Amino acid sequence: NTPKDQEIKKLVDQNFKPLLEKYDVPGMAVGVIQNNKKYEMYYGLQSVQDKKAVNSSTIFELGSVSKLFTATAGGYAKNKGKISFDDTPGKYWKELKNTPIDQVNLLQLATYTSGNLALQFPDEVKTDQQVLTFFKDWKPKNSIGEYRQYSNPSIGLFGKVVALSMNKPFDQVLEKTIFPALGLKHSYVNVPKTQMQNYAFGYNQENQPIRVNRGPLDAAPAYGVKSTLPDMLSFIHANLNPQKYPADIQRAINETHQGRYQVNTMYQALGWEEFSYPATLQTLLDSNSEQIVMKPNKVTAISKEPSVKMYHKTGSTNGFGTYVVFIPKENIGLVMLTNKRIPNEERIKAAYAVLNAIKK
Ligand X SMILES: *[B@@]([O])(OP([O])([O])=O)[C]([C][C])[N]S(=O)(=O)[C]C1=[C][C]=[C]C(C([O])=O)=[C]1
Among 318, 328, 349, 358, binds ligand X (CB under 6 A): 318
Q: Which helix (H) or strand (E) holds 248?
A: helix 247-256
Write each residue from 19 to 58 as x if it is in contact with ligand X (CB under 6 A), else as -, in one continuous string: ----------------------------------------
223 binding ligand X? (CB under 6 A):
yes
Q: Does 89 contact ligand X by CB under 6 A?
A: no
Q: Is 64 a catalytic residue?
A: yes
Q: Is residue 212 at the binding interface for ligand X, with CB under 6 A as the rule?
A: yes
- Nearest-angstrom CA–CA distance, 348 and 269: 19
How many CB atoms within 10 Å of residue 249?
A: 22
Q: On the CB side of 43, how many CA atoms lie within 13 Å of its CA?
A: 23
Which one of 64, 114, 154, 234 is the catalytic residue?
A: 64
Least distance between ligand X and beta carbon 12 (Å): 21
Considering only the stretches 45-53, 160-168, 308-316, 324-332, report the one whose residues sit in contact with ligand X under the rule CB under 6 A. Answer: 308-316
Distance CA 275, CA 294 (A): 20
- 184 backbone dihedrals φ, ψ, rounded to 5°: -90, 130
**Quick count: other Cβ atoms within 10 Å of Cβ 30?**
27
Residue 155 to residue 335: CA distance in whole angstroms: 22
Sole binder of ligand X in the list 152, 227, 250, 297 (CB under 6 A): 152
Q: Does 287 bind ligand X (CB under 6 A)?
A: no
| Contact indicator for 150, 118 with CB cutoff of 8 Å | no
How far apart are the C-alpha atoms of 337 and 192, rounded to whole Å?
Answer: 20
Measured from the CB of residue 146, what is the shortest distance to ligand X in angstroms? 21
Binding mask 92-121 for ligand X (x = CB under 6 A): ---------------------------xx-
CA distance 350 to 344: 10
Helix (H, G, I), strand (E, B) or coil at 286: helix
Shortest distance in whole angstroms from residue 332 CB to ligand X: 22
Residue 205 phi/psi, 5-degree rounding, is -75, -5
Nearest distance in Å: CB 63, ligand X: 3
Strand-pairing partners, residue 209, are 203
| Contact with ligand X (CB under 6 A) among 1, 213, 243, 303 | 213
DSSP 178: I
Residue 13 CB, nearest approach to ligand X (Å): 25
Q: Which range of residues in 183-191, 248-256, 298-306, 315-323 is near ligand X by CB under 6 A?
A: 315-323
Sorted by sequence, the CB contacts under 8 Å of residue 11 that are 6+ apart come out as 353, 354, 357, 358
* Nearest to ligand X of 144, 293 (CB atom): 293
SS (H, E, C) 21-65: HHHCCCEEEEEEEECCEEEEEEEEEEECCCCEECCCCCEEECHHH
A 10 A CB-CB count for 338 gives 30
**Whose CB is nearest to ligand X?**
64
Quick one: which segment of 39-47, 123-131, 175-183, 312-320 binds ligand X (CB under 6 A)? 312-320
Which C-beta is closer to ligand X: that of 212 or that of 358?
A: 212
Amino acid at 96: L
- CB-nearer residue toward ligand X: 93 or 121: 121
- Give the nearest distance from C-beta 1 to ligand X in angstroms: 38
33 phi, psi to nearest 5 deg: -115, 130
Task: Check binding of 289 to ligand X (CB under 6 A).
Answer: no
Q: How far is the CB of 293 from ligand X (least distance, A)?
A: 5
Contacts of 295 (CB under 8 A, 6+ apart): 149
Binding letters toward ligand X, positions 54-83, x by CB under 6 A: ---------xx-------------------
Give the binding site for ligand X (CB under 6 A): 63-64, 119-120, 152, 212-213, 215, 223, 293, 314-318
Which residues form the catalytic set? 64
